[PDB]
Write a protein that binds this ligand. Structure first.
Ligand code: CDL
Ligand code: CDL
Ligand code: CDL
Ligand code: PC1
Ligand code: 3PE
Ligand code: HEC
Ligand code: ZN
Lengths: 114, 66, 144, 89, 295, 109, 116, 43, 64, 84
């Protein structure tokens, strides 16, 4: 894309016909502090205090961090487990052996006192 | 940090000469030289002192009146 | 980039049409205006500062035809073009205003969207001649 | 209050009777095309004095029965005990 | 990639053009509580179905692979099931694998841990007693056209006449749901045949529905275990959906952060040759290439 | 073949040319040295290390990297106009020269 | 190459579309409205001939009369445009910027905005 | 939600065919620059 | 730790980012251009052949 | 809020959906070895993600490190729930 093939008779890493960029066209660095990109929640000093406490008291002890991971797994399991079971049990309340036995006992009482 | 208005910090309008900026910086420096406000003053004057830096800062702002 | 100086209108036009730049800045200069001396230095500084434009300087005295081709009225003139279409034009010597115009044109063009196959370079007069056959041609066919 | 009140109507399912014959003789108009096709197949097979054993009216009748029971079966089940939907879904 | 619907082969599966197959599922929708969304079995329905099976269906058919205590905690209690099963008798000759455990030598009352055996000792005895045909075992009857609907449709559907050219010999009956539309079962379910314990009216569709529910309940991978497994599927799907954002964060965001590099290339003209490029290089497969490739 | 020329022009030359221009490359990077040659080809590596200057393969790899650094991070990447123009500056005649010279050199040596 | 009935129905609706399309000059709209009335005239005559109905020829001449009265009203309204300070190009009677016009430019009648 | 800081509407559209670079607003009250006036006066 | 947690995630909004970039530039441009034509041809031909085979089966089964 | 974040991210200027530089850009390391000359005339970077991908939190970096640990922990916790 740039030029002809170059063989090993040039002896210099950069051939003389390769153009260089003068310093006047180089992008100068910015040497000041830009404003931080932070959200509303994390800009709260209380949240920063919580993060500092969490770091210094749990993150710096790896087995305590492993306990933290175990707690996260516990929360994951219970979040994915409890509501589905609750709605499943609430959906089939009338399809229960207790209801069937209640109906059977009522019919037996009626037939007995008939 | 947070977004800062250099002209408001130096107490000068946008169409102010360089010597006006120098005088404003000196007046504000006599007072707060011996923290945060002095740092803001220093940053604003450092940006607005260089003509190229001041021009680049002015181009990005696209100021509103008032 | 770097200023390309020209004294012949045909050579400069051929160079620009072969390059087909996306963003170009043309500096038309003449020797009657004493302020053209500072305009050369301003053009050089802005050319080395900016890399998205192609900076071409044309001497009107040695290439008078160029003036007529570019609708130059009062030298020094700085003509800013995008894809050969006139973005803007500045008359006079002032570096801050020239840099402001360059920055404004650059940001507006960078905020633009072009459908595929309709972003090719075009010649200058092509815009004037397109509207000429739309308005001037029919008017001349009615009055004359 | 409903549930603790007497029932106004006693269906024949609730009387321990099979309404399938009535439902069949009522779902027949829904499948008149298949019934006519089966009749035509039977008429065609009757005329041929000699026919391949592979040839039979079994498949038109299969289609007609499929349509009739498609009409019939679900509505009988929908009235049975234990076929009620759930509390929510 | 598209299949006809009027040739009797549902969805391209051929081999069942000799019977009615799609009534329960495709042509019409028979509602079963255990096959709906977040649905489960009806305990009373399964109870009545076992009553129907014990009083009528169990006199010819069997479920050898399964025992009576499948019904615990869902249809019956231990004591009531114990008496109900004890109403029937079993013999040592009934046992498929009569090891040293079964030390009886005569008839005895059945227990809830006994396999559900037919009154016959053998399949050949069943064939001899039933006019040459064998009452099919119900252990794997789920693999029939429309499964539970198959059982219901076979129990019903004795209301048609054979067409011209089809002859029904003695000892056989016309049933469109059976293979070749000729079955050796006389119509069993008549109105009021079984007196339910719960007082539910006993009609032919009701008894067929109950017995179908019971037989499907006894099945594997489609009975007494499917609803909880579907609920588990829903929970796992919710877990995967909720964990998707964190996986995206880690993988894709980390890669995009790692790929935010700055590169600079400079001119090096200090008179040092690239001997390391000319006289360098390694290859792990050199032991394969050497002596064979490019000589 | 002469009657089939428009179809071949539309669906072979222009297809690859459009894809290469979108990636910011030319037919150089797809026809001079193959992809399977730039990576894991001991014969090509030996010939290049024995005869070639580093900038050939280095520049081809640099163009590939400058595209794929962005492409891997966020897929569906179209290079801007200032890269596509640099790509389009190169014509097929110089590519033909390079391809023919390289093939002849490899054969002869 | 097209049947006359479909042709004339399409012609009437295309005339209405073109009337809406063209720039809003009162005289142009008047001319296009006259053309619309004439298209209705032709369509009525065609159906009168096809269906052997004598009332549609009456529709032709009644269209002539209605169009004549409407044209008189339009001429008077244009001359009224003269006396009021209005332009026959209605798009020049408002300050809503329009990209379809090359040279739309209005500003306040002030020589300068600021004094100090 | 109504944002009072956004005061744009169809009344304030300021897109013109002549100007390839759109103007800041629809008030055509733009004055000449100081260097342009000086250069034209010198001409 | 000095960079965005999720950089460049929804720049340009739903319409631009998701629709344009994902669908048009990745999905269509990298997959559908390559296989829409042969897949369409194969699907249509397979449907036609299956329909013909099923029609032969129908002729075999039904004689009227 | 999420709506505000979407509103700011909606106004970004992009080239066909990608945040890339509109002009050639060159950078030089002022402390580079003396045998390194000037920048060669090759466009090595199309993007500027080294500067655009920044939150400017150099006064609090351990907080972001802790947050990254927490996100990793949540992901690992889900995986470990399934493994359990
Ligand atoms: C395929 C699917 C791909 C999906 C990709 C992700 C979609 C967008 C998600 C939002 C987003 O852009 O997040 C980037 C964002 C990082 O922002 P950034 O790119 O660094 O922007 C820099 C800003 O200056 C902001 O800087 P910062 O310092 O504020 O950093 C932000 C970061 C800092 O905070 C953290 O890192 C928190 C670490 C985890 C805490 C516990 C979370 C549970 O997060 C927060 O501040 C969030 C605070 C808590 C919000 C809780 C909302 C849900 C409540 C229920 O990360 C978060 O907000 C953390 C995740 C919070 C939500 C997680 C679950 C979301 C989905 C749940 C439903 C899923 C249904 C399926
Ligand atoms: C499953 C759902 C699929 C949904 C999408 C279906 C296709 C939609 C097509 C469409 O509207 O594209 C516009 C749009 C993309 O348009 P574009 O990227 O601007 O491309 C502009 C042109 O379409 C030009 O696009 P192009 O230049 O990339 O493609 C050229 C196109 C030009 O079309 C042809 O050449 C037609 C060939 C027909 C057969 C010719 C036989 C030989 C001559 C006789 O040819 C082909 O695509 C076929 C390649 C050659 C086949 C073999 C020929 C021999 O489609 C999408 O964005 C689809 C998004 C789908 C998201 C999911
Ligand atoms: C019909 C398609 C059939 C084939 C589907 C397939 O195999 O997909 C492969 C595809 C493999 O992913 P990939 O091609 O490596 O790239 C996906 C990345 O997420 C790509 O990430 P990205 O950075 O390119 O962002 C794009 C993302 C952008 O993310 C979003 O649009 C999510 C927005 C979340 C809320 C944000 C609110 C605003 C926040 C503002 C502040 C920040 O949108 C999508 O990815 C949309 C398409 C999702 C895949 C197809 C989903 C249906 C699959 C089943 C079809 C049957 O499979 C999936 O993505 C599976 C997703 C889960 C499927 C089951 C649940 C639904
Ligand atoms: C030996 C290495 C692995 C040790 C086991 C635990 C790894 C996960 C927990 C952990 O330590 O995380 C923190 C570690 C390190 O986390 P870190 O680098 O973020 O640091 C945390 C520690 N502090 C903050 C103190 C520095 O993470 C990993 O090691 C990640 C790799 C493991 C990812 C999860 C794998 C388990 C789930 C697989 C399920 C597969 C399906 C089920 C099986 C099917 C086939 C039978
Ligand atoms: C409490 C959440 C309930 C599910 C989400 C809301 C669904 C509302 C509509 C509805 O009732 O959908 C039912 C549908 C399954 O019903 P259906 O298709 O009839 O039965 C399965 C045989 N195909 O349900 C479905 O298709 C959803 C199946 C997946 C489970 C829900 C996942 C939600 C996201 C996590
Ligand atoms: C003895 C007289 C029986 C009683 C009581 C019940 N069934 Fe039966 N059944 C019996 C026989 C001899 C046969 C075989 C017919 C043949 O020609 O093969 C059957 C068949 C069935 C089937 C068909 C299963 C198959 O293999 O396709 C079913 C679904 C069936 N029987 C169900 C069933 C039910 C639910 C019963 C209780 C009401 C019942 N049968 C009683 C003999 C006898
Ligand atoms: Zn009826």
């Amino acid at each position: 894309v740039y030029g002809k093939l170059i063989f090993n008779n040039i002896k210099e890493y950069t051939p003389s016909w390769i153009k260089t960029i003068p310093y006047s066209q180089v992008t100068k660095p910015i040497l000041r502090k830009q404003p931080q990109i932070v959200g509303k929640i994390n800009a709260d000093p209380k949240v920063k205090k919580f993060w500092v406490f969490l770091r210094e008291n749990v993150q710096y002890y790896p087995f305590l961090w492993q306990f933290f991971i175990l707690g996260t797994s516990f929360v994951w399991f219970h979040v994915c487990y409890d509501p589905w079971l609750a709605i499943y049990q609430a959906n089939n309340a009338h399809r229960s052996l207790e209801t069937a036995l209640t109906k059977e006992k009522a019919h037996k009482k009626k037939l007995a006192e008939q | 940090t947070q977004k800062l208005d250099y002209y408001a910090v130096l107490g000068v309008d946008r169409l102010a000469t360089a010597e006006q900026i120098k005088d404003s910086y000196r007046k504000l420096a006599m007072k707060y030289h011996p923290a945060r406000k002095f740092q803001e003053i220093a940053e604003a004057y450092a940006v607005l002192s260089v003509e190229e830096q001041r021009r680049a800062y002015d181009f990005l702002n696209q100021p509103s009146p008032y | 980039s770097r200023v390309r100086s020209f004294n012949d209108f045909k050579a400069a036009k051929t160079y620009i049409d072969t390059l087909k730049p996306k963003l170009a800045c043309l500096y038309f200069r003449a020797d009657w205006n004493p302020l053209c001396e500072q305009a050369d230095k301003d053009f050089d500084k802005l050319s080395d500062t900016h890399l998205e434009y192609e900076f071409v300087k044309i001497d009107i005295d040695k290439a008078p035809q160029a003036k007529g081709y570019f609708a130059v009225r009062c030298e020094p003139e700085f003509l800013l073009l995008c894809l050969g279409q006139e973005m803007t034009r500045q008359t006079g010597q002032n570096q801050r205003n020239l840099e402001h115009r360059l920055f404004k044109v650059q940001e507006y063009v960078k905020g633009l969207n072009f459908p595929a196959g309709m972003d090719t370079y075009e010649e200058f007069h092509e815009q004037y001649m397109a509207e000429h056959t739309q308005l001037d041609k029919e008017i001349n066919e009615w009055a004359r | 209050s409903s549930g603790d009140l007497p029932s106004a109507t006693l269906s024949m399912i609730q009387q321990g009777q099979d309404p399938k014959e009535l439902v069949l003789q009522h779902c027949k108009p829904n499948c008149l095309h298949w019934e006519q096709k089966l009749k035509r197949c039977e008429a065609k097979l009757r005329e041929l004095v000699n026919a391949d054993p592979e040839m039979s009216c079994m498949y038109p009748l299969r289609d007609w029965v499929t349509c009739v029971e498609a009409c019939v079966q679900p509505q009988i089940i929908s009235q049975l005990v234990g076929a009620q939907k759930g509390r929510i879904w | 990639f598209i299949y006809r619907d009027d040739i009797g082969a549902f969805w391209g599966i051929k081999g069942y053009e000799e019977l009615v197959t799609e009534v329960g599922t495709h042509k019409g929708h028979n509602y079963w509580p255990q096959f709906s969304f977040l649905g489960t079995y009806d305990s009373g329905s399964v109870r009545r179905g076992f009553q129907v099976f014990a009083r009528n269906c169990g006199n010819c058919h069997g479920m050898i692979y399964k025992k009576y205590d499948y019904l615990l905690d869902k249809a019956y209690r231990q004591l009531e099931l114990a008496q109900m099963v004890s109403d029937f008798t079993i013999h040592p000759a009934h046992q498929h694998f009569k090891q040293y455990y079964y030390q009886e030598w005569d008839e005895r009352d059945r227990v809830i841990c006994d396999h559900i055996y037919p009154p016959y000792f053998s399949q050949d005895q069943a064939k001899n007693a039933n006019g040459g045909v064998w009452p099919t075992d119900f252990s794997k009857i789920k693999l029939r056209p429309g499964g539970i609907n198959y059982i219901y449709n076979i129990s019903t559907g004795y209301h048609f006449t054979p067409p011209f050219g089809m002859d029904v010999p003695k000892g056989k009956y016309f049933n469109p749901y059976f293979d070749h539309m000729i079955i050796g079962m006389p119509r069993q379910l008549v109105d009021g045949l079984v007196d339910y314990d719960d007082g539910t009216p006993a009609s032919t569709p009701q008894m067929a529905y109950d017995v179908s529910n019971f037989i499907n309940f006894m099945q594997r991978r489609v009975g007494y275990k499917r609803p909880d497994k579907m609920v588990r599927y829903y929970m796992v799907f919710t877990g995967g959906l909720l964990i998707l954002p964190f996986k995206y964060f880690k993988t894709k965001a980390y890669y995009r952060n790692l790929l935010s590099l700055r590169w600079e290339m400079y001119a090096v003209r200090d008179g040092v040759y690239y001997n390391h490029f000319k006289y360098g290089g390694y290859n792990s497969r050199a032991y394969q290439f050497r002596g064979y490739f490019w000589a | 073949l002469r009657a089939l020329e428009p179809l071949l022009a539309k669906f072979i030359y222009r297809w690859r040319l459009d894809i290469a221009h979108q990636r910011g490359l030319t037919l150089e990077d797809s026809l001079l040295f193959m992809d399977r040659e730039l990576r894991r080809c001991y014969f090509f590596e030996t010939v290049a290390r024995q005869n070639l200057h580093p900038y050939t393969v280095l520049f081809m790899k640099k163009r590939r990297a400058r595209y794929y650094k962005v492409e891997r991070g966020l897929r569906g990447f179209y290079v801007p106009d200032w890269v596509r123009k640099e790509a389009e500056e190169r014509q097929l005649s110089e590519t033909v020269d390079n391809i023919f010279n390289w093939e002849n050199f490899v054969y002869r040596e | 190459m097209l049947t006359w009935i479909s042709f004339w129905s399409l012609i009437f609706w295309l005339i209405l579309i073109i009337l809406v399309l063209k720039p809003k000059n009162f005289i142009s709209i008047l001319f296009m409205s006259e053309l619309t009335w004439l298209a209705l005239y032709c369509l009525s005559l065609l159906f009168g001939a096809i269906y052997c109905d004598i009332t549609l020829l009456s529709i032709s001449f009644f269209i002539l009369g209605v169009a004549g009265l409407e044209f008189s009203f339009g001429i008077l309204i244009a001359i009224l445009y003269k006396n009021l300070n209005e332009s026959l190009n209605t798009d020049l009677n408002n300050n809503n910027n329009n990209q379809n016009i090359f040279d739309k430019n209005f500003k306040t009648p002030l020589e300068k905005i600021n004094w100090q | 939600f109504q944002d009072n800081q956004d005061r744009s509407r169809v009344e304030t559209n300021s897109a013109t065919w002549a100007h390839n670079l759109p103007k800041e607003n629809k008030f055509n009250t733009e004055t000449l620059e100081k260097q342009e006036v000086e250069s034209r006066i010198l001409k | 730790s000095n960079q965005f947690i999720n950089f460049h995630f929804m720049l340009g909004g739903f319409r631009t980012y998701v629709l344009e970039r994902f669908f048009k530039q990745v999905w269509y441009r990298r997959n559908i251009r390559t296989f829409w034509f042969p897949v369409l041809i194969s699907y249509t031909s397979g449907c036609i052949t299956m329909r013909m085979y099923d029609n032969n089966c129908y002729d075999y089964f039904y004689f009227s | 809020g999420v709506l505000s974040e979407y509103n700011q991210r909606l106004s970004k200027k992009l080239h066909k959906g990608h945040l890339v530089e509109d002009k050639p850009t060159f950078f030089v390391t002022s402390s580079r070895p003396g045998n390194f000359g000037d920048h060669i005339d090759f466009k090595v970077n199309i993007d500027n993600w080294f500067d655009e991908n920044r939150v400017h939190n150099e006064h609090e970096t351990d907080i972001r490190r802790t947050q990254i640990y927490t996100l990793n922990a949540i992901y690992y916790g889900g995986l470990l729930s399934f493994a359990r």
